């Protein structure tokens, strides 16, 4: 029952490309890699090799085979403690999942500023160039399940947890700017409302279902997010390459004591790209785990996530200079307006050892600050307070939840909480309260002051009523979705089109359907008309004839809104499949690995069966995958190499790889006889932009194929997509 | 009022094909099936239609858009007990799922015998042809986590609550005649060998991975169940259209005490029927609910699920 | 500073006997002791001096005295995440009590074997003599809840956690060496009938009552058992002078595979000694926390708890050969037919630092066994080997229990158990699974052998039908409690009769009462009509005529199983009360407190007031407590030196101590004029036995009154107490 | 949320109103009330936003907080008319 002579059950401990060894934990894929928080976790770690096998109290176990019976076919004796604590231990593996966000895939990194923010804020952890926090960042979905699929259409959770010598600070993020609802006491609403309804509970991973819709027609302060969610933000090609933001305006606090607006901002460093929806649908099936499995080998690969901290910075006298309220999280601040002021680098370089212990415990909250960082009074920030402590106390089992090894602290703590569930401090301190003098008030408070200092509230001015009511202010709904539809490129908008044509198709009551497609003739009427020519709606006068919302602030659009309008490709990290044929032209593969090693870009080597093929030259070519076992859905383009094609030319699976990737715009590129494949996606002898060929691989191919890489799809193609039947 | 005036939002309680009316909960949509075990748990359905929304202390709520605040624009204040109710129930929504069958399906019906089993059995609900037994029949696969995808290939649980006279009695079954593994002391590593593998927790709803295959290739009593689990057992049609079967010899005893050794089958009455796998693994895409889904409009539309 | 000038808030760290020092943690009081368990805890034990004061986050916290308000006499904000914190923490602290048991005290102590007993045991804490095995000891009581009184009459529990290079090993003991009931099953009957009763949830810490008394006039296994908690045995002194025993028969196994019958005792080096009702009643009242505080401050005196552990060895061979069945645990093992083996040697001598996280979270389970052990079909065994890993799952949290620190074995643990709620462990192994090749099979079985072998169950013979069925070898009810009877002296017997007589006046359904002196009429008639008349029930001439029960393998009596048959006193650590005047005589006290340090016996100086007082020779003479304030039932003397009598001769408080302490049987000693005091106690001009007098505080006047304290109590007394309105 | 095991403690039988109580919160720990409503959210269309919101009023209406007011600046400090 062991390891092969060979050694091939274990990785190597070095960076290597996806599927060139098994992944594993990452203490043992990269010892080496270390980091404060990383380091601090050495105390639950628990290794494995010569080892004897034991139960939980240290018993060793001589039969792991069987349990114990009177004779060896009688029944099993209640006396078999070590039966009945494996099984117990099994019977009890499960805790509560997130109420939201349940899906998610996380790491860990570090993170350091370019150079010191003293001016604007005291936050130690942005207070030298040369001081390194470690953070744990965990990517999710918001709607669906811990085990539904990675390629959804949702919004994206980006949460960094960072362990600063002043205490933790969580950034909780999503991947777009804003959020569909204005006041907390919305949310559970807001969230039922898209969760699988409570008869059946379908649909899952989906808001394509009629009490989301119904929620959104009669709520149009959601319609500036449900934007971004039809866009192809809700698509991303992977948690690399989107945005993040904090979603609400918080405050930085200087050692003076002035307030500075902020909102948080990351920039992807690997450049912003999404899927396209058939795409991303067809990976839920082929492949539900797939940003969960690119992020990871990612890591393992040496191609660490890398994103740049960014704040947009709005002094306190500009607070009502905008014709939005900067408290409204339906709200974005146009960067065209505030510029986003560069501010530090994350690195993500290990993964975690165990998911359950680090990833599924981990507990992220906003409310978790540090001094030098505020709140303002956003209603939807302001509930968020309560809520991501007191959900702890049922998920993760007690109040003592910031003593599971992920979330502690690697700075000092010291207080007189004690007790609660599965207490793993224990205190030695005489005293448990304080005022004390039994052990002379320690620990003591600290005032504030400009560095190591207790935190203290920036004292904003509060006057008004008690009431329950949503400010004037926030009542105006379509101006920003407005802006971001005006911002996008034309085929971003098509894509936006087919996101509502393709839900509301699914909504079953009709009237939903057309209450929506009134709420998009607030927003922009060529819009309202492509969603309601799909469903076969047609606009009354009136709705033809609603007014425009006015522009924001003068702004017509801002082209940072757009995926893709500003080019920002970065190949490294992206992967080629390059398929197979039982006599490749060696000289062909040379050139393709060569070129894409060159720009750290990753192949996998596809076939008919699994096992070698010998290539001309002789060598002997290992097969990642089957046609069919790594579907184009998978891959960034496509190359097919010279050599025995008719071996392939007929294969149903090799056509159908190009026509799929070729509906998918994704590059193509076709050497010597593979030309051939030519007339399965119909190009002309001509050629087309998007389709590299020549006689061979070489500089000029390589160069040709990396460069539409760089440009991510080949949206040119879009009108001749229609007509494959892929 | 929000309902559109033609009543349109409301689905006829009538049975309907599928696709034809929105889905409903069972007691809107057929009011009038009815049977001893749905009659009993009248005593905690709660309707909602013409009552005033409150706390869950009974309190009238006027304002449910808003939480308190110092100003229109200010901060919000600790003593908003509508708001916390609220959000306090909102933040443990959640309970643990299944360690195993996380992802299921499930409905109500009920159970007759054909005749008397008095000769071989002295057990209530079988001894009367006119005796009708309430179930609950939960469908379920094995691997995936409750918001994973149905048309995976697994193996299928088929579990029958049946409410009668004399107790409870859980028939938990599956969809083929066989488990993996001999002896129970071995269900972890099994489970483990087959779950997501605990680095990275991939793949949701698959065997298709190292830890399953090196299982197998170490105990190879697997080998019969991987039989079935790699044939289009694993992936049926429908939880209509896949056989059920209650695994061990249990014992059947008699009123003169006699023991006779029995194995319990289910038949679907609608066939047997499975998916192919190109098919069962798109299916997970483009509707990760396609049984769940089937199995309740089978029941709007009256294609009552039977099984022998 | 709030800590005085002078640093009298700090206890000494050093050994000082009780009520000289303010108690502190044990790793402040005394920072020297160690063992491998108490070193292992430090990476969890929190410290305070010199740290500020932080959220659980690393947060520090300016004012620690405030909620944040929208102005200070405004509303409390819900962004005070400080607020929120500290009060989540608090609102939380309680976990479920233990369902029996729930009252209990705790201390960490070490273990060391007199000699190898590899020829009849493997287990390897007992197979070297210089082999040390730390160990956490938690007495307690078994009906109370967590915050019932210390000196109820029940039975006591005696806990010992084992942590040995092989596994934990919990003996999980009682004070009698039997129980009430013989099957497990029952279990929740007797509890449930013992406890509060369920309409209204009293009577607390007490068996006098009705469904107590219905279950036992009802099955008459329980009077065995009930024999021994109606004794003095119900109310011992301190944990320290209480006999423990495992319950039952477990088995030895060697090297060779050889079974021998066990059963575990331990005897306390310090002597066996219990109150007597009307004082431990009232103790209950006057210091609830008695035996909780007389524990931990012996071990801050160095006062170490002591008990020699014993094995009673039975061959297999010897199974049938004694009037009873080895397997029925209402049934105990003669001393007279198989002597107890002397062992090792326990010592307890470190209290712990934080009574919740060491004591409240400790579980201890019969089924924590390791190789060299085994168990037997006792069905009482049987069934507590379910219980004591499933009531963790609420009590504890979940199945990570043993990952709470006291619960740690420091013997390595190593398994494929994976997640559960509290996880702290973080697995780097590859593999979840076996058998595996992923991770060439670690941890890995290991072989039953010698030493540091797997657990294999012994190879016992099981023949039988599946029954729900009692061995008709247990039916029989009355011979060990009519042994245990006859085995007591006198003064016992009188104490018996008392117990019962005055439960049975409890019970308020008079045929309960009848029915109980009907069984007990089938034990003994002496001890059936004493408990008759105290009740106002005649026993009937059938009654009268029931013939006793066979005497136990020929035993008519047994006198190890007697508390007080055979002298084992031990003065070391018991406590005088002197009781001081306004001029005390200084020559009598310098030659009390000398004689008493020299013995280890400890004084307390009380007075009518606190402060100090002057000697006759201007000593100043602190005052520990007043009359009231520590009375009588606290200390096993009573002296009065010479001097100012007339100054304490008409105090109420003074007279009423000696009246308690003379009612008590303790003994009392008066030097000069305080011999005016024998007045108050009525006691004749030419003495009487157990009070000490004499003209002045020695010669031998000390002597004397330590024979008394050697003696426990003075039994001649019984037949005066009656006489005295005390 | 850990004395009474999750946030239904309301539908322990003591606990429990008399008055009716009906609202869109699902779920939770041992849930005793099986809703029937279609709608888990509100605003809805499809259960016509039953159950809704009521205004204030003399009786039977629903609750708003008097709206006291409130004016200072966010502080932890302790009224000095408590010294
Ligand atoms: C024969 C059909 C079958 C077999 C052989 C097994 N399962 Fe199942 N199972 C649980 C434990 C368990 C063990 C210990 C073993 C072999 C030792 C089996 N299974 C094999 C469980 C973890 O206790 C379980 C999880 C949730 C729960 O309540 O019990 C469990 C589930 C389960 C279901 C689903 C029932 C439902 O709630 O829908 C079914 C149909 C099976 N098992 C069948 C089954
Ligand atoms: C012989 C010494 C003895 C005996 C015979 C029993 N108890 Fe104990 N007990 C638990 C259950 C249990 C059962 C099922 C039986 C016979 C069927 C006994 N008891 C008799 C328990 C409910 O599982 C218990 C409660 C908390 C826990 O973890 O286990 C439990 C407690 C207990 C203690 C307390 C240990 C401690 O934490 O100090 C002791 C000394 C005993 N039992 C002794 C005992
Ligand atoms: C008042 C309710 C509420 C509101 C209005 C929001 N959140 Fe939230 N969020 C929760 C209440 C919550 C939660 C219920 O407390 C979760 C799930 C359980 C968890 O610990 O927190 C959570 C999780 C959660 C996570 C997952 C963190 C993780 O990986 O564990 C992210 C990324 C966000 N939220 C992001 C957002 C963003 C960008 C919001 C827009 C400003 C937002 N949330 C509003
Ligand atoms: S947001
Ligand atoms: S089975
Ligand atoms: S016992």
Redesign the interface.
């Known amino acids: ?4 002579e060979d050694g091939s ?2 990785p190597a401990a070095e960076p290597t490309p996806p599927g060139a060894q ?7 894929k990269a010892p080496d890699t270390r980091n404060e928080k990383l380091n601090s ?1 050495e ?26 019976r ?2 060896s076919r ?3 004796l ?2 078999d ?19 939201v966000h ?2 998610g895939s996380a790491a860990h990194g570090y993170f350091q500023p370019y150079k010191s923010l003293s001016d604007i804020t005291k936050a130690d952890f942005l207070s030298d160039p040369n001081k390194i926090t470690p953070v744990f960042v965990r990517f999710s979905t918001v709607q ?6 990675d390629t959804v259409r949702d919004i994206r959770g980006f949460a960094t947890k960072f362990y600063t010598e ?3 600070f969580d950034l909780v993020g999503n991947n777009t700017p804003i959020f569909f609802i204005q ?11 898209v969760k699988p ?9 989906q808001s394509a279902h ?2 989301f819709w ?2 959104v ?3 149009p302060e959601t319609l500036h997010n449900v934007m971004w969610a039809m866009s192809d933000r809700g698509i991303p090609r992977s948690y690399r390459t989107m945005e993040g933001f904090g979603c609400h305006t918080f405050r930085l606090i200087n050692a003076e004591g002035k307030a500075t607006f902020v909102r948080f901002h990351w920039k992807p460093l690997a450049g912003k790209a999404s899927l396209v929806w058939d795409e991303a ?9 797939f940003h ?2 690119e992020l ?1 080998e990612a890591i393992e690969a040496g191609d660490f996530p890398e994103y740049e901290l960014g704040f947009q910075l709005i002094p306190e006298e500009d607070e009502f200079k905008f014709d939005f ?1 900067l ?1 409204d999280p339906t709200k974005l601040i146009p960067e065209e307006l505030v510029p986003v002021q560069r501010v530090g680098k994350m690195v993500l370089n290990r ?11 981990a507990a992220f909250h906003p ?5 030098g960082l505020d ?1 303002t ?1 956003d ?1 939807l920030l ?2 968020r ?3 991501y ?3 702890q ?8 939840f ?1 003593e ?2 992920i979330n502690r ?23 448990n309260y ?15 002051g400009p560095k ?22 926030f009542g105006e709904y379509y101006s920003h979705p407005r802006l971001f539809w005006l911002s996008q490129t034309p085929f971003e908008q098509r894509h936006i089109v087919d996101g509502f044509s393709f839900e509301l198709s699914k909504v ?5 359907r057309e209450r929506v497609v009134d709420q998009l003739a607030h927003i922009d009427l060529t819009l309202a008309q492509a969603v309601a020519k799909n469903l076969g709606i047609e606009l009354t006068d009136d709705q033809l004839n609603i007014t425009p919302p006015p522009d924001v602030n003068g702004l017509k659009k801002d082209p940072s809104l757009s995926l893709y309008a500003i080019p920002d490709g970065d190949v490294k990290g992206r992967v080629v499949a390059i398929l197979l044929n039982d006599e490749v032209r060696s000289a062909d593969l040379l050139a393709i690995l060569k070129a894409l090693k060159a720009k750290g870009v990753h192949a996998k080597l596809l076939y008919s069966r699994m096992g070698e093929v010998t290539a001309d030259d002789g060598t002997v070519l290992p097969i990642a995958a089957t046609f ?1 076992g790594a579907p184009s859905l998978t891959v960034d383009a496509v190359i097919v190499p010279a050599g025995n094609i008719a071996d392939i030319a007929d294969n149903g699976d090799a056509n159908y790889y190009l026509m799929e990737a070729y509906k998918h715009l994704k590059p193509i590129a076709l050497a010597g006889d593979a030309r051939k494949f030519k007339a399965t996606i119909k190009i002309a002898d001509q050629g087309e932009e998007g389709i590299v060929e020549a006689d061979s691989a070489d500089g000029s191919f390589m160069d040709e194929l990396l460069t539409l890489m760089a440009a991510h799809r080949v949206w040119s193609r879009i009108p001749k997509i229609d007509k494959i039947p892929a």
């Open positions: 029952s062991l390891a092969p059950h274990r098994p992944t594993a934990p990452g203490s043992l976790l105390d639950v770690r628990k290794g494995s090799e010569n080892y004897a096998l034991t139960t939980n109290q240290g018993v060793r176990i001589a039969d792991d085979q069987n349990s114990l009177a004779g009688g029944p099993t209640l006396e403690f070590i039966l009945r604590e494996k099984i117990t231990h099994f019977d009890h593996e499960r805790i509560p999942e997130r109420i349940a899906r669906g399940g811990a085990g539904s699929a002043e205490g933790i006041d907390a006491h919305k949310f559970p609403d807001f969230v039922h409302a309804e409570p008869h059946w509970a379908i649909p899952q991973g009629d009490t119904d929620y027609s009669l709520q649908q067809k990976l839920t099936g082929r492949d539900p785990d969960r499995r990871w309220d408290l993964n975690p050892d165990n998911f359950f212990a680090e990833n599924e415990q409310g978790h600050i540090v001094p709140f009074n209603p302001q509930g307070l309560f809520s402590t007191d959900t106390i049922s998920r993760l089992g007690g109040p003592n910031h599971i090894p602290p690697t700075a000092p703590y010291h207080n007189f909480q004690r007790d609660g569930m599965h207490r793993m401090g224990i205190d030695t301190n005489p005293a304080e005022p004390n003098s039994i052990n002379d008030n320690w620990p003591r408070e600290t005032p504030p190591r200092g207790g935190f203290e509230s920036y004292q904003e001015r509060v006057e008004g009523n008690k009431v329950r009511e949503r400010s004037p202010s079953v009551r009709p009237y939903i069919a």
